């Protein structure tokens, strides 16, 4: 019934073949680009634009329950798996998707503005310098959001 967003891991260099298949199947998806802000080793927030994936090898896909539990998506060549727990795909938290979808639909200048309501831990992940370390922190973050909670 209701549709959720999931993280799909794929072979990074094969994005064109993977995205073409997903578009053929008429899925809503996006591979976000690295933002134009990052925290330097000296901790100052600086500007750049490198036209790189935000999380290399990962894309966000919207699907219902029967689509993520069927093997139609994971059978696509160079698609590896959904980000899962015990084999069960993990839907992305709504506040995370809110920030990501806002950056997809707005300008780079508006995406760079100091926006209230961004979860602090996710905002700091978006500022991470190295793309592969940024992916690993993001996976750990959405896993921690799914499996834990503090009062």
Q: What is the DSSP code string of 86-147? A: TTEEPBPPHHHHHHHHHHHHS-HHHHTS--TT--HHHHHHHT-SSHHHHHHHHHHHHHHHHH
Q: What whole-number distance in Å separates Cα of residue 112 and Cα of residue 133?
A: 21
Resolution (in Å) of the shown entry? Answer: 2.0
Q: Are 19 and 31 in contact (CB under 8 A)?
A: yes
Q: For residue 99, which of 112, 116, 118 has the smallest C-alpha distance?
A: 118
CATH number for the domain harbouring residue 115: 3.30.70.940
Q: 121 lies in which domain range?
A: 4-147
- Number of folded domains in the chain? 1
Question: Which method, experimentally, gave rise to this model?
Answer: X-ray
Q: For residue 9, which of 129, 133, 114, 139 has the smallest C-alpha distance?
A: 139
Q: For residue 126, which of 52, 18, 62 has the smallest C-alpha distance?
A: 52
């Amino acid at each position: 019934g209701p549709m959720e967003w999931y993280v799909l891991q794929f072979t990074t260099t094969r994005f064109a073949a993977v995205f073409a298949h997903l578009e053929r199947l008429n899925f809503s998806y996006f591979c976000p680009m690295e933002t134009e802000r990052y925290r330097r080793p000296d901790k100052i927030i600086s500007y750049r634009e490198r036209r790189l994936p935000l999380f290399p090898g990962y894309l966000f896909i919207q699907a219902d329950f029967e689509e993520v539990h069927s093997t139609t998506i994971t059978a696509i060549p160079y698609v590896q798996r959904f980000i899962s727990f015990g084999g069960e795909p993990l839907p992305v938290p709504e506040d995370v998707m809110a920030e990501l979808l806002y950056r997809q639909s707005h300008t780079t200048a508006q995406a760079n503005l100091l926006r209230k309501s961004i979860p602090h831990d996710f905002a700091e992940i978006l500022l991470m310098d190295n793309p592969q370390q940024r992916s690993m922190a993001f996976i750990h973050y959405i896993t921690e959001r799914s499996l834990t909670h503090k009062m």
